[model samples]
Every structure is written in C-alpha cells, then in structure tokens.
Target: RPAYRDPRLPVPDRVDDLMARMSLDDKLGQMVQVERKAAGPQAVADHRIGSVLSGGGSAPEPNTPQAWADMYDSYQRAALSTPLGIPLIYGVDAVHGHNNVHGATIYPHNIGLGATGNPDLVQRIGAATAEEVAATGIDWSFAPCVCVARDDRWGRTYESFGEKSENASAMTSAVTGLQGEALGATPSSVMATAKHYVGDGGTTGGDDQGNTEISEQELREIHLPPFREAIARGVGSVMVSYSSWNGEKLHASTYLVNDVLKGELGFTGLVVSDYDAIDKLDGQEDFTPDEVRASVNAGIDMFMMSSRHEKFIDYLRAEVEAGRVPAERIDDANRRILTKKFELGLFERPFAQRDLLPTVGSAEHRELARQAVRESQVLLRNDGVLPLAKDGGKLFVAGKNADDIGNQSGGWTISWQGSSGDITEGTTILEGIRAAASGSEVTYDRHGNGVDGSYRAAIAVVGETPYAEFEGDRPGGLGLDEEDRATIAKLRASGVPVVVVTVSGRPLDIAGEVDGWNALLASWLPGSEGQGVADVLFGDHNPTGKLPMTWMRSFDQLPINDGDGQDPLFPHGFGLSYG
Candidate 1:
C-alpha cells in the first residue's frame, strides 16, 4: 500500500504524500465545500467534490439521523470513486447539540451554557453532541461559537457564551469535548470548528455580518482571546465570518485573516468561509476573479459555496491557472485540509458509526442535556417567591412560550430560522411544571386569560420566539415587546406571587416590570430538557446560573456591557441562589 494510504504514517507525511500524487483538480476539489442540494452523486464524482454540507436546516427528506447517514454515505461513495479515492468530509452547524437532525438532543445554547459556569459540563455536552453528529456520518461541526458578544441586539447573541472574553475563552473546553482527547481518536470524535474567526461579536449595533469598528488593541482584548485559546487547544478548523472589520470584508482581507489569525495566532487548522461568503466579498451578487484570488491568498482554505460548487471550482481553477492565485497557496490549503482528513482517520473510518445511531437523543444524552438545563437557570430576581411548592397546590402557567418547545429552543432547531410549537421531541416547561407538581394542580393559558388570583403561584414563561442570524436582530430595541408585557400584565393581575421565567436568547429590558415580578429566572433557550427548569422551580436543583450578558434596564441601554460604566438592571455575573 502507498504511504499516503497507510494508516500508521504520520498525518503530515500522509498529507504530503497524497498531495504530491493528487492532480490540481483533485487539490482544488478538496478545498471547496458545496451544499448537498447542489451536488448530486454524479456531480460530486465529476468534480471530485472535497466536501459537502447541510447549511443549517438543510437535511434529507425523512430528516432522521439514519437518513443523514445515508445521504452522507452517498456523497462519500461518490468522492471515493475518484482516482485518489479520497474520502469526503461532511460539515454541519451542530451549534447547540446536533441541532439540524430531528430528535437529536438539543442542549442549552451558548448563552445558557455560559450561565452554567461549568466548563467541564460544557465539554461533556460537546462529547454528547459529537456522538449524535457521528451517528449521522458527519465528520465536522461548526460549533462552540467563541464570539464574545459585546451587544445584545445581535441576532446571533445566543451563539456566544457571554459579553466577556473569559466566558468564551473558558468555553473553549467545548472544543476539547467535540474533538475529544485528540481529533479522530474515538468513534464518536468529530472535528470542531472555532467559528467566525475574530471580532464578529463586537460588530456595531450587534448587527449580524455588520462591520466591527475598533482599534486593534480593543479587538485583541475583547474578541481575539477566545480564538487564541481555541487554536491553542488544537481545534480542527476555523471559520471566517462574513462580517467586516472597519469597512473591509473579512473574506477579502489578507492581512487580518492571513497575518492575524493564521500568522500572529499560528492557527494550523483549516480555514473555511461562511455560507456563500465569497459572494459577499465584493459586495456583489456574482463573484469576481479578484474576489476569488483575494480570499484564497487571505488564507481561507475552504469555500462554503452553497448551491454553486461548479462555479467556485471554475473560478478557483481559472485564478490558479492565471497565476493570480499561486500554486503554493493552493498546495498549503490542500495540505492543511488533507492533514485533518488523515488525522481524523477518514481513510479507515469514513462510514457512519451505525452502532452509535441509537445514541441520537438517547436517554443518556437527554440526561446530560437535563443537567445542562438545570445548571443554566439564572435567577435574576427572587424576592423569596422561588422554590415553588411541588406539593398539592394550585399552579398557573401562562405565556406563548410557556408550553412551546421550539420557541424556547430558539433558532437553529429543525429549521434554519426555527419555528414555533412542538417542532421536535422535548419536555416543555409546562410539562416540567406538571412533572414536578406531583399532587399539585396545574393550569396553562397561552394569553394568560384564565390565570386568576386563586393559584398559589403563577409561572409566566415569556420572551423572544425563534430566530437566527440577521432575522433575530433587535435593532428596534431589546424589550419584551407588547405581547410579552401584556401577558405578564395579565399574570400579575391575579395578585399571586408571579414567577417570570424568561425563555429568551439574550437578557430583556425588564426594569419596568421586574419590580412587579415576585421571581425572575433567565432560562436562556434551554433545549429539549424542560426537566432542568423543573429541577430549579421545585428546589431539586439550586439556581447557579449567572447573567452571561449584562441584564439591561431598558432598550435605551442598547449596548450596555460589563465595565462600560453604564448602570445595568442586573450586572454581569449576577445571580441569586435558592439553596
């Protein structure tokens, strides 16, 4: 057998041996990751497609874990049919658990995990998520988003661990969890990508893909801290953000991407782009020659050219042939890409670990998620009204999010932007309330209509609904809005000790009404496991979660953050325990 194909050879040597024998077309193929819908088996084989991805919500018709495995194997078989017989790597945004796969265990989003204040638990969550992803035959996950969200208005705020670098930096343990003791070391081990490279969370107005205008010192201090630790942890990949630095597109900046991250930071992992990121490089609909060359030279090793693999292959090939993109750069990218594939043992274990399929949203994984849910509950204000009696007492639950799983789970669920009402299997907060109630009678009202003064206590699960990326942005102001405020008002009319459980991605402007709320819990998008919420409400678990983001008083404090000298409703790291 050739040294390149030998399982015992060092990954770097194997990568070099493979690169030497691979044609330019093959090398280019390894560097472009296309959407599954755009490249069928034949198309993949024809282009020697290096990688394939399901851009958030993109899945098979049946959308089961097995269906994902089947889809992946079909693509893999196609790529393996090429001359070099290189194994194809598949990527997905398994951001908060194997989120895209149906019935998969959805853990609390980053904001929730940040509140948990437990890196070990976050790391374990990573391992559990990896098992689910591996069961689906996927090899790469775009997760553990290390962006330090500086503003609450950002649509992707929940993706970040906190507004501080320490939160994101501490959560780098999540990378170790996803990759395991070493990349490709175990059957469940999958590649973890430390995403959006640098300065994404610091964007002005917290805009998704918006410009981040700050000095180099500020950028390094606030944003680069997390990526530094991620690279130090030997993360498998780094994804570039579509957001710009100052006015320059990150996809087109050679100095920042190449010099800063890959240079100053010394990141050896593959550098992949956001979905169709190059198209937005020149601020044009169609990609240009310069855009392709600039991005390649800027050290982006892989292109997420969703629905346009053929076009990307053609463009990249042209630039390389015209000497606009040097052959050395292409070789370096291929080297980095192939090194990971080899290290992951793709040549030996390319197929899905079918035995692990049953572990997708398994009872064991659900328990792990339950622990995360329990630990993520942050009690922002508790005037001795929490630790509700779980015995025989009247309990009233109300609000749009009170009984909805999808809404509380937030964006990046089965669908891309996420939707409302039971989209997947999970114990709702209402279900949790009942399970904990035992002999207690429970009542629920979506609009709080039936909630009256007779109940012993009222739990109003209210806050933001499903949204992702730019659509979830709150440029209008981060408040409870009319609907949430109205629901809380109705619950408050009962004159019962009202417990406001905020099922939101970020902190809301609750100063106006928090004074009226007898108890306030910041339950940041706890996925699937409502039992954890119950654990806190019933005094089975202590409220250990702290405010990951500084709780704002009103929308007027649009970008209020820790150490910003602005008075916040609840300061960062603020939380009260019931125990």
Candidate 2:
C-alpha cells in the first residue's frame, strides 16, 4: 500500500510520498475547485478534481441534511475511484451556521456576534456551525470573514464582525471552533477559512471589489491584523480577496499574497481564491494564461473556479510547462494542499458522518443560536419606555421585517443574495414578540396600519431588505427609505410612543428619525432565533451588546472608525443597559 493510504504515517511523510507518485495532470487537478453544480461526480473523477463547493443557494434537490450527505458521498466515491485515490474536500459558505442547508440553524451574522464582545461565544458558534457543516459531509467553511469592515456602505458589512482590528482579531475564535484546537481533533472539526484576505472591507467608496487605496502601513494596521490572528489560530485556509490594493488586484499580487501573507505572516495553510476571481484579473471576462500564471505564482494553492474549470486546467498546465509558473511553485502548492487533506483525515474518513445529520438545526443548536441573538441586540437609545411589560393591555408590531424570517436572516441565507417572505422555517421577530407576550394582546401589520394610541407602545421594526456583496453597496444616501419612514410615521401619528428596532446589516443614518423614536434598538440582522430580540426587549436578557461599528449620524460620516475622531451619534462600544 502507498504510504499516503496508511493513516498511521505522519501527515508530512504521507504528503511527500503521494506527491512523488502524482503525474502533472494529477497535480494540476488537485489545484482546482469547482462548484458542485458545474462538476458532477463522474466529471470530478474524470478530471481528478481536488475539491467541490456548494456556493450559496447551491444545494441538493431536497436541500436537506441527508441530501447534502448523499451528494457529498457520491462525489467522494468518484474521487476515491481515481488512480491515486486522493480524497476530495467539500466546502460551503457556511458563514453563519449551516446557512445554505434548509432546517439548519442560522445564527447571527458576524456583525451581531461582534456586538456580543465575547470571543468564547463566537468560538462556540463556530463549533456549532462546523458540526452542522460536517454532518452534511462538508470539510470546509468560507467563514470568519475577518475583514475589518471600514465602511458601512459596503454590501458585505453584516458579514464583518466589527469595525476595529481588535474586535475582528478577537473573534478569530471562530477559527478555533471550526478547525478545533488542532485539525482533525474532533469528528465535527472542519477546515475554517480566514477569508477575503486583506482590505476587502476597506474598499474605497465602500465599493465591493473596488480599490483599497491605502499605504502599506495603514493596510497592515487596519486590515491585516485579523488575518494575522486567524493564521495564529491555525486557520487552514486563506481565501484571496477579489478587491484591489492601490490598483493592483489581490489575485495578481506576489508582494501581498506571496511575500506578505505566506512569507511574513508565516501562514502554512493552503490559500484559495474567491469564486471565479481569476477571470477578472485582467479586467476582462476571458480566462487567460497570464491570469492563471499570476495567481498561481502569487501563492494561491487552489483556484475556486465555479465554471470553465477545464479551461483553467489547460491554462495552468500550459503556464507551468512554459516555465512561467515554476515547478517548485507547483510542488509547494501541492504540498500545502495535500498536507491539509492529510491533517483533515480525509484519507481515512472522507465520507460524511451520517449519524450526525440529526444534529443539524437541532433544538440544542437553535437554543445556542437564540443565545447568540439575545446577546447581539444593541440598545442604541431608550427614554424610559423600554423593558416593556410582558403582560400588557395591548402591543402593536408593524414593519416588513417583524414577521419575515427571510428578512432578518438577511443576505446569504437560502440564496446568495437572499429574498424575503417565508424563505425558510424559523421564528420571526413578531412571532417571538407574541411568544414572549403570551398574556398580552399582540397585533401585527406589515405596514403601520391599525396602530393606535390605545396600544401601550407601537414597535416599528424597519430597515433595509436582503442583499449581499456588490448588490448591497450604498454609494448614495444611507438614510432610511421612504417606505420605512412612512411606516414609522404612521405609528407616531397614533400618539403612541414608538420603539424603533432597526433590523439592518449596519448602522443607518437615523439622526433625524431617532429623535422621534421613544426607544431604538439596533437588531443588526439577527437570524433564525428572533426570540432573542424579544428577550432583550422584555428585560429577560439585559442589553450587553455594544456597537460593533460606529453608529453614524449621517451618510456624510461614511468611513468613520473607532479612533477616527469623528463625532458619532452613538460611539463605538456604546450600548444601553436596563437602568
């Protein structure tokens, strides 16, 4: 038997033995990762593909845990049938919980978790997310984004843990949870990715895939610390960002990806590219040999080619043969990639732990999610009208997000750019309010219709609808929309004090609107467990969550940070307690 096939050998010994026997085709195949929908099990075997991923919203037909497990096993069997029998690793964007899988617990986004100020809880959430991901036969999570979201206008702001490097750096506990204290330490241990490596969240004008025009010192101080922490925690993968740094694209930068990340930081894990990121290297749509050579030589061990993978393979092979990409580079990439596969124990146990399927979205998991939600609620403003009585005369709730699970879960829920209205099964904020106020009469309206002075206090849950990445950027006004303001106005006209709960991915421009609000809560995209919001509202849980990002007074203060010396409506780390 080959040394690689023997699990007892040291991982390095096994990786060296396997690399010695692999053909150039086999090595090239190991460098490409394609979307599962684009590459079937047979294609995975025929091409000797190394890894597969279910992009956000890409799942099995039924989209259940069992379906995921079955699909994973089929792919694994195909890869195992190859000459080398190298096991393929499976990945998913399980950024918050096992988000793509239906019935899996969707926890708060990183912004919410950042509000908790508890790295321990974040670590536990990572553990829970890993358990769910592993149950589905997945070995990787593109998570703990670790991007220091510098601008609120960026569409992926909710994905960031905080605006400060310390906040994001501390939350690297998610890496510990996903990969365990060491790789393969537990059955549920999955490889965690410290993603969008460097400056993704610092893009100018808060543009997604935009340029980050900052000095190396500023970039290292502001954007690089969290990744440094993630590497220190032994994160198994570092995903290249799609954005550019001072006009040079990250995928094409040898100084940043190769010298800075791999050399200076001493990151030993495999580096993967963002989905189809290489195609945009030359600012055109075609996959060229130059793009392939630049990315490979830039120290990217794996290419996340969602489609056109065959073309990528040809390009990479041609580049290697022409000596544009050195043989030593190929060897280094394979060494890093194979070492992770061995450390992941995929060679010995490549299949899903089917017995763990029941744990997906289990009651225990939801309870932990609920705790996360409760701790994430940041009370931005209160004027003696909060901690509303549970057994009241009447309570009125109005807003689009109050009763929508899809809205609160925000982007990257069931879809890539998530949609609204009953997208999945979960407790909505209105349902949570009703569940908590069992003894009180609760009325809800999607709009603010029927809210009257007779109610003790009208709760207006309003904010931005679901969006993800480039589509979510707000280059213009960041104030509440006309519809949201109209909804709030209707409740205010009733002469009832209004408790405005902003169910958004980031702090909005609410300086003018908040003055009219009797109380204000920054819900920050609480997912699945809406009851946690109610717990804080009813005093069952004290509001301990601080502002993970500075609550901007207006859109003019777009790029404000903790120590930027800008005047904020609510400063960073500010949150109200029940006094």
Candidate 3:
C-alpha cells in the first residue's frame, strides 16, 4: 500500500513531494495542541495549531450539545482561514461516555464495564461515546485507558478496567470499535487514544503521576501488554504519561518511546504528550528551544500545551529553524495527525448537525446508563434484610448522596473536579425509592432521624463526592472521608436495621460500618441513573453484580489482591443474593 499520499490529492505521489510544498509554520503548527478554552477563534487562525482540546470540565459556553457543536465549528472555521486550510482536530476526555458534558449518556466507569466481561458491550459503549462526542463536532476521544492499575489505592483506579492484564486486553476492543476500521469508514466512531503510555497504573505508593519502581521485564509483562493490544487493535493515538520508569521520565525516555513502543511494538499512531508533561523535562528551568527539541526528538509527536501556547509555538518554532528538530520529525507528526483527520472524514464534513443534539440526553441513552448502573452495583453484604417488601411497610431513606445527583455520579460529571448540585438531569436514590414504593410513605433526610420505630426499615445512601486524580486521593486512611464516616455513625445510631449504599469510584475500607448495616452495596459511580439503586433495592432487579476491586479491611492492607491469602473486608468478586 502507498504509505504517504496526500489525502486531498487524487493522483499517486511521494510524501516528500507534499512535504516540500509546506512551510516551517505549517509543519510547526501540526505539532502544537492547545486547550479549547485557551485557544479562541483569533488565536487558532494566527497560530494555526494542529489540535484543540477540552481538558477535563472545559465544556462549551452553554454546555448543551448544539452549543458544543457551534463552539467547535467556530474554532474549526478559524483554522480553515489559515494559508493551508488544514482542519484542526478537537479532542476531549470522554473517558466514560462523553462524561464532561451535562446531558451526554454517562456509562459506568471502566472497572464496572470490566465486570460485565463483555467486550462487545464495551465496544458498543465506545461507539455510543464516539457518536455523542462527534455530535458536538469533536473528532477525538481520550479514552480506552489501557492501564492495568496494580494498586487499588490509586485515585484513578476506576479509570482503568481492572488490575488483570486479561481484562485490559479484552477492553481494547472498545478502542478499535471507537476509532473504526481505516478511519472515515464509520461516521459514529471517533479517534480513540490509548493513554498514559506504559506503567502509569503501577506507580510506587499508589500516587498519581508517580514513578514506577518495577523492573522493565515486569513492566512489559503487566503494564505494557494492554497498550500493545490496543495498538494491534488500531488505536489512532497513544498518549505519553507524566510518570517515570526506573528514574527516567517517560516524556524524555527514547528507549521506551522510540525503541520499545515505536520500534518493537510498531505503533505507527501519533504519540501525544499528557497535559504540560513535556515542559516538566526542563526541571525548574524554562522549556528552552533545546529542551523542546529533545522531547520531540525523544518521540513526542504532539504537545498538549494546556497553557502557555505562545511559549510552545515560539520555542518549538525556534528549535525547528535551528535544525535541532528535523523537518522529517515534524512531517511524521503531521502525517499521523492529518491521516487521522482524513480518516475521520473531517475534510468532507467538518460540521455537526444541530438536530442530532437531542441525542445527548435522550431516553434511550439514559436507559443504557440505567442498565449500566444496575450492572455495576456490587452487593457486598446481605442478611436477608434486602429486597424490602414493596408494600409491606413505611421505608425511611436517608443519607447525603441519596438525594444528590452530584454525589451519586461522583467526580468527572459536568465539572472538572466534579461538584454537588442539580447541575444535570438525573434521578436521585430518594426519588427512585419513592417511585418504587408507590403508596408506601418514603420519608427522606440527610440525617438518619426519621427512624424512631416508625419505619420498618432504614436505608442510608452515602459516599464520596465527585473528585478526580490527586483531589480524590486519600492518605493512609484507605476509607471514607470524615463527613462520610459521620453520616454512617448517624445512620447506625438510628436504632433501626439499616442498609448502607456506598457510592464511590473505587473500593475503600468499610469494615467499621460492615457490621453495623444489615446490607451494603458498592455502587461504583453509577451515572445519571440513581434509580438503578432502587431497582436492586426493591427486588425489581436482583443484585447480580460482583466487586471489580478488592474491598480492604483496613488502611494497613495496601495493594491487597483476591488471592492475597489474607482476609479482606470483602473479597474480590464478592456479591450477595437479594432477589
């Protein structure tokens, strides 16, 4: 097959012929990646940046689907005004079903999807996520994170499918499904990026963006296998990690980026940097022209400059002109990026129809979200107190998250770090309970005060609020936050048999409350469908879901596994029957 023909040209020609026609500015522009919020219409036209992205929570002005399409259209229009008229690729962190947008159907986190043990379902979810993302005129999704999180304490653990290489390898089917075959062939599919490159999930101390202490052999066995699978499945891009491997920053490591990944694995896809990761190589010194050249030469094809666009352009341009960064390297990056754009059919149709905006939060998508929620709820414990008789007695529902959509969804919903509010339309556990128990009085409260022998059973739904990355990290506690602990204490003191629903993105130490509650459900960030809780709670749905991660007995039990030969608060794959 001809490798380097211009996608726009009709006749066969060498890639060098096309490369000779392009100027330094055009080639340099192909390597820059600016955040959508930072690069406006005027900035895009002037800089002619190759890509624009929405870093977590940076939604369009109105945040609606049409608004997102319009915003992207405007920026794209600006890029077209440049001399070469090369269309810019717009990307977002649609990690879980176009999550940053309000009405977009949010699927269960990767961990939950891993439990489904259905790669086809994952592919469909990826396609759904792609369609939703494309509806907003965005062409790329930073998704299908191929990290095998070895340590459960990692804040971004849920972002991964599971600890097992088998699960991660199986999940890469979603990447091929999302990117589609040979690009532009699938309209619904968007470019899928296999991210954080090698060993981001095996960091020492389970810290975010921390160093990986494992040997290169172990790294290849565990962490690198998923990405290799993803590449084989035709993932369009691979993102470099902020983390280091054996004292070398991945951003600056040629042995891994060039030798292992590009040479051995044969990943021809574009290699982009994590946000501002390349700049860190300067180590307190400003990212000079020489430093930027070294990073690009080290195999970083694109720079995700979240801020300091002017600096990126100036320094990178100077490096290219100084001959430190070869023109061939720039062409290599542009070819990868442009090929993906051509494959996405952006040249033919650069705009999204406003009519498709309704699909963002439609009933059909919400139903899928609900189904995912139902499938993700892991029943940790049950003492025959669950499946509360539908019409047997008055039910008291109380807890901070029972009535809060923000809390139930956890972090990475409608906001960067996530928030607690009526930011988006979704059912609350309190509302679901009331709907489930028709004619049965359902008293709801944040505190567990409505249970003075008045109600037959009390259900307390509480857990961590929406948070992301380092913000969600707990130090040595390995359990609920202070506020969640207080809420559990209140619910336990109510003197009535209580069932606790723990909604979070990852497993935490819950041994203290394990003995207190008659039943416990680990609802791992069930999005836009709090009613899924009621589905399992009121016998409408059985508790068939099993734990995706191990639930620890205490903080001291770090990195506990299913086959650890030690007792856990809840073992891996543990689930209770409540029909």
Candidate 4:
C-alpha cells in the first residue's frame, strides 16, 4: 500500500516516500547505530535503531555461521516489526574476509595484499568477504581501509595497502569487489566502506588516533588519493577517522567530511563515524551536546555509538529541535542512509540468504585466499636457501609464529585485537610445511632448542605477535623480540643454513640480525590458508610479492618511506626471486 514498499520504484523515490511517512523518532533512529552487546533485538526495535554491529569478539553462544545468521535475523525481524517495517543494516569489520565469523576464510591483511600488487585479487577477496557477510545476514562491511600508511610505527599500518598513495589507490578495486559493479548487482553484495577518511595513516610518530600535522597539499596528495579512487569505484560508505588533521578531529571536520569528501570528491554515500568517535571530538571521555552537533553537522550520516546510542539519539534530537543542528541536515543524513538500504535490496530480502552460508570458509574461498597468500610472499633475501625441495631429507621448523593461526592471522581476527594460539580454523605454517613436505622428515619446536646440523636446513618463523590499533604501535623499538631473537639464535648456532620467514604486519628492524640469515621472506600476516606460505617455501608457488612498506635498516630510520630520501633495509617495491 505504501509507495516506499514498492520494489519497482527508483531508489530516490522510495527513500523520499519512506521519509515522508517517518516520524522524527524514526528519522533519528536511522542516524544511529548500536553494538549488539549493549542493545539486543528488542532494544534495537524499541529505539528504532538503524544499524547494529558486533564489535570484535561479540558473537552467539556457539559463534557458528548458522548462529550468526539466526542472530542477524532476530535483529532484522525486530526492526521490521515497527510500524514502518524498515529494514536495519548490520555491519562488521570484515576488514580481511568475514573476520568475526568462525571458520570464515581469512585473507592477508592489507599490507600483504599490497605486497601482492593484485587489485583483482583484492577485489576477489572483497567479493568473498561480502558473500560471507551476506550469508550471515549482514549487509555492510567496515572494510577496504584505504589509508596510505606513511609510517610503519602506526599500529594500524597493517590496515593500509602501502606507504604510497599509488599503492592504496590501485587497491580501491576492493570497493568494487564488496559492492559489486553496482549496488544490488549480486545477492551476496554488501556495502563497502572507504574508511578513516583522510590522513589516518600520516599521523606523526605513527600514533593511532593522533594528530596528522601536514599541509593541505600533502594531505590531499598522500592521504586523499585512495579515498578518491574508492569513491570513483562507487563505494557505498565513507567512515570518519579517529585521528585528526591539523589538530582538528575528523569527526568534527566539516571541511574534510562535508566539503572535501562529499562535495569535492562528489561522494553520494552515507558517512559513518568510527566506534564512539564523537566522544573524542572534545578530547573527553564523555560526549557533549556540542560534540554531537559538531559531528552530525560535519556530515556524519550515521553514528556507530557502540554503547551510548540512546544518549546520542537524545542529544541529536535536542540539537535538531533547537536548530543548532538543522532538520535539513537530519533529512540529508536519512536520505543518504535510506538510499543505500534500498540499493542494497534489504527491503525485498531482509533475511540471510541461508543457501550462501555454505560459502563461508568454503573450499573455493580458502583456495583463493591461499593464492593471495602465495602471491603475497615477499622474498627479501635468498642465498640459494629458498624454494626448498618438498621431497628433501630433513626440514627443521622452529619459532612461536610457525604453527599458531592467531599469530599468523594477526589483528582484527576472531577478536578485535587478536591473541595467539589456535584462535580459528586454518592451516598453520608448520601444518602447511608438513603437508607440503610429506616426503621430508619435518620437525617443529616452538623454541629452536632441538635444531641440529643433521637437518638439511632450519626454517625460523618469527616476528611480532598479534596486536591491533593503538596497542600495536611500537613507540619504543621495532626490533625482534627477545623470544624471536633467541629462537633464531638457536637455529643459527646449529650451523644449518637458516631460512627466516618473518610473519609480521609491517617491516621489522632486522638489519643487525639479517646478515646471519641464509634466506629471508616477508610473510605479512597471511591469514587462514597458511599452506600458501608453504607453497612459496616449497617452490609450488614462486614468491611474487614486493615490499608494501620500506623495511628500515634500523629503528633509527623510524619514518623511512618509499621516497623519503632515507636509505632502507629493503626499499619499497623490492622483492627477491629464485631466478
């Protein structure tokens, strides 16, 4: 009976029709997103919440794909039960595949994908990610973090494609992959977010959520290119950064969000804030009315209030009624948000496409992820020790990173800030080595105490443990940890030619320790299919990856980048080959 419910109507007409019937409460609800933990299905409906999210580690009791689908449907049904029957969008940080769901295929972090130099692969990964997300009834992924990481010390460096604008710009195909050639083009399509808007990666001292002190020209050149490219690919959303530019928090920067991103770049999609980002607008723990008004007027169409959804809605409504935040602004935000929901076909198909659930961590997706991992292997050094024969006599694998899935997958995994141990289902590097080297006698030691000259060669897998943004920032030093150093030392002491595979999200300070290594490979957080690592190791797949960030000669060259004039241990784009 309602024109808004008509599937044949144009998206704009449908959005306009829907808005005409909505009360201010409904419009206000469209602007707010709450975490599932703080507000379950009943709460979401009672508040008329527009979106729901599962912060990392938030899942059902079983945490299975089926459970996730059921959870998503419960929330969707609640939202539909309201008088309007409007569908709510569910979002997750499927940054590197459907990362939150157990057994979902995990691809390499952006740094590894950057090393691959394969936008097509990135796009495919995006599609796979979207399929998994859709199968679980989620329609949005807070992904394709297009930040151009200028400094390796940034805790979120792994989220960036590369240190150069060109590298990240090329990877905007991820946007195309997530949203498809056009929104609603596929049953599995999920909205893609070009996130942390501008200059998150250029923060001084690589601090997370810190100031990015740079000229406008530098910001436009270094940080804005990838976003522009992502926009060109028709990304459906832009997420505001937690970081600041020129001492102004991005959540409150109208010049950047409204003027630059929406106006200059001609982005028509909705703008969402980072989790509770408004609270940081005034450098305070609690969000103020002014802070709410500033962020909303700055062109944030949606607020990801992880817990403070009610407070945000009340504040926003008060501001709008007071005319501090115009009704026109609220209308604009709702228009942008509703247009996407329509374009996503959520009104017609609000429930999970259960048939697609089988695709989650399916064989095909894992194989594709495996290929991505194989391609991402950056051979940094080789003195005839790499491409070891799978049928060899003996292979000794040693180190904490060798067999741990959590350590290899790195951050934004099953948990927000990842932890070590068998966190999920995936082939560990040691498992892959064993599978590949079936004919060879393979032995693994978490520490290399058992390494001996009797082995044909020693493979030392070691690097930084699991960590995410803020916590991951290495402000003090970026050298090998004592555990990794001790493991490598033990392997080297055996007189066996040592092949070192550094499993890290960014380059490590290995200049002092590398000389002792007979070979070196940079495995940048290859997720799930650790067999891909073994593929490169056993010569099944040649290492084709290039360094996405400059490998510093030492921690002294802290901010070394592609064209920064400082000498690096391994320059960006540098990769070795067996040939």
**C-alpha TM-scores of all predictions:** 0.99, 0.99, 0.94, 0.99
Error of 1 at 307 (Å): 2.0
State each model's CA lDDT, in order.
Answer: 0.90, 0.92, 0.79, 0.92
* Residue 402, model 1: Cα distance from true site in angstroms: 0.7
* Residue-level lDDT tens digits of model 4 in 1-579: 799989999989999899999999999999988999999899999999999989888888798999999999999999999989899999999999999889999999999999999999999999999999999999999998999998889899999999999999999999998999998889999999998898999999999999999999999989999999999899999999999999999999999999998899999998999998998888889799999999999999999987988888899889988999999999999999999999999999999999999999999999999999999999988999888987668999998899999999999999999989899999999999999999988999989978898999999999988899999999898899999999999999999999999999899888998988999999999999999999999899878999989989988888888777998889999998778
Tens-place lDDT per residue, model 3, 1-579, is 232334565312433454466787777777888987777987977887889899888986787887888888999898877766677888889887788887888777788777666687788778777778888888888888888877777888878887777778988988866777655676676889998888988888778888899898889988998998898888989999888898788988889998898899998888999887877775664566666877888888888987677788788777778887777777778777766766676766777645567777778877877877777778777888888878757888877788888777766778877788776888988888888888798887787765666677888887777888777666666666676667667666767778888877778778876887888887877777789889888887787777666777887887776676768887777777764
The C-alpha RMSD of each candidate to the native structure, in angstroms, is 1.0, 0.8, 2.6, 0.8
Error of 2 at 12 (Å): 0.4
The alpha-carbon deviation from the true structure for residue 112 of candidate 3, after best TM-score superposition, in angstroms, is 2.6
Query: What RMSD value applies to candidate 2?
Result: 0.8
With a 3 Å backbone cut-off (N, CA, C), the pairs that clash in candidate 1 are: none
- Greater TM-score among 3 and 4 belongs to 4
Q: Report model 2's TM-score to 2 decimal places.
A: 0.99
Clash list (residue pairs), candidate 4? none
At residue 516, candidate 2 shows an lDDT of 90
lDDT of 1 by residue, 1-579 (tens): 779988888888888888889899888888889888888877988888788899878999898999999998888887788888899999999998999999999999999999999999999999999999999899999987999998899999999999999999999999999999789889899999998977899899999999999998898899989999999888999999989888888888888889998888898889999888888887878677777888998989998877777777788899999998999999989988998998888899888889999999999999999999999999888888889986688999888888998998999999999999998989999999999998999998888888887899999899999999999888887778787888889988889889999998998877877889999998999999987998998899988888889888878887888999999889999999985
